[PDB]
Amino acid sequence: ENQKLIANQFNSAIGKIQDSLSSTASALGKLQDVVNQNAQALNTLVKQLGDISGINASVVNIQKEIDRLNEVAKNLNESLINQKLIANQFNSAIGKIQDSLSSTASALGKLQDVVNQNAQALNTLVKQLSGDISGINASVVNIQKEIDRLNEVAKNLNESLIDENQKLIANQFNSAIGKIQDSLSSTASALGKLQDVVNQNAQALNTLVKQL
Amino acid sequence: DISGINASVVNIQKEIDRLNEVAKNLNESLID
């Protein structure tokens, strides 16, 4: 039966996608924590040190988005797998995956914004305090291309939904997988860029402390 | 009074590696 093959290939894909959602939630949580830790570090520096007294790094809260990713990862178990049943289970999975992509894009945007806000805060502190610290400069992160791509995949997955029909199901499924692969590659890119800028700005703050 | 302030670094390379690994392995889930 080709239906066994479709069901098994689909079930295989869902499990891998669940893996990726669990890993994404973990990376987002770790970024959230370190961003907030380094925001606290910067604010502690300002407090210990008139023209700098109002400088304040912001905290990020993406716990709602992280929670949703884990919830979709768990709820995708109900989408696991007769052409009606396959089509309905597939369509069910796509909508949950669309939800997870929308939530990931949101979390990435909030991280981008807070990282850049806190980079500006650190650079303002340096400017106010400025010989030996004057070149210290926090970098900004730009992941808008990746965020845009996630939302576009979330939207374009509507065309992969299912309304001979094994070909149609197979082709619609294959279409969805390629879009999801695209979104996974873009998510990984966005996470690496955030990781790199967070670490650059942590080093910048630590360099400021050492010089002062 | 500032000498101990220390920003932390983040390491999510394990998670990033897994996303790309899933993106690649999803090729095997494709239907002929």
Numbering used by the authors:
A (entry chain A): 918 to 966, 1167 to 1198, 2919 to 2967, 3167 to 3199, 4918 to 4966
B (entry chain B): 1168 to 1199
Reproduce text from the manuscript describing this model.
S2 subunit includes heptad repeats 1 and 2 (HR1 and HR2), which mediates viral cellular membrane fusion by forming a 6-helix bundle (6HB). Unlike HR2-based peptides that cannot bind spike in the pre-fusion conformation, 5HB features with the capability of binding to pre-fusion spike.
The other three constructs are truncated ones, including 5HB-H2 with amino acids of HR1 E918-L966 and HR2 D1168-L1203, 5HB-H3 with amino acids of HR1 A924-L966 and HR2 D1168-I1198 and 5HB-H4 with amino acids of HR1 E918-Q954 and HR2 V1176-L1203. 5HB-H2 consisted of 5 α-helices and interacted with HR2P to form a coiled-coil complex. Overall, 5HB-H2 created an extended hydrophobic groove via two of its three central HR1 helices, accommodating HR2P. This groove featured with a series of apolar amino acids from the two adjacent HR1s arranging in an interval way to form a hydrophobic interface. For HR2P, its helical fold would align I1198, L1197, L1193, A1190, L1186, I1183, I1179, V1177, V1176, A1174, I1172 and I1169 almost on one side of the helix, matching the unoccupied groove in 5HB-H2 for strong hydrophobic interactions. Via the structural study, we have shown that 5HB-H2 assembles into the proper five-helical structure and binds viral S via the canonical HR1/HR2 interactions. It is worth noting that the HR2 region recognized by 5HB-H2 in our structure is highly conserved, such that the amino acid sequences are 100% identical among SARS-CoV-2, SARS-CoV and other sarbecoviruses.
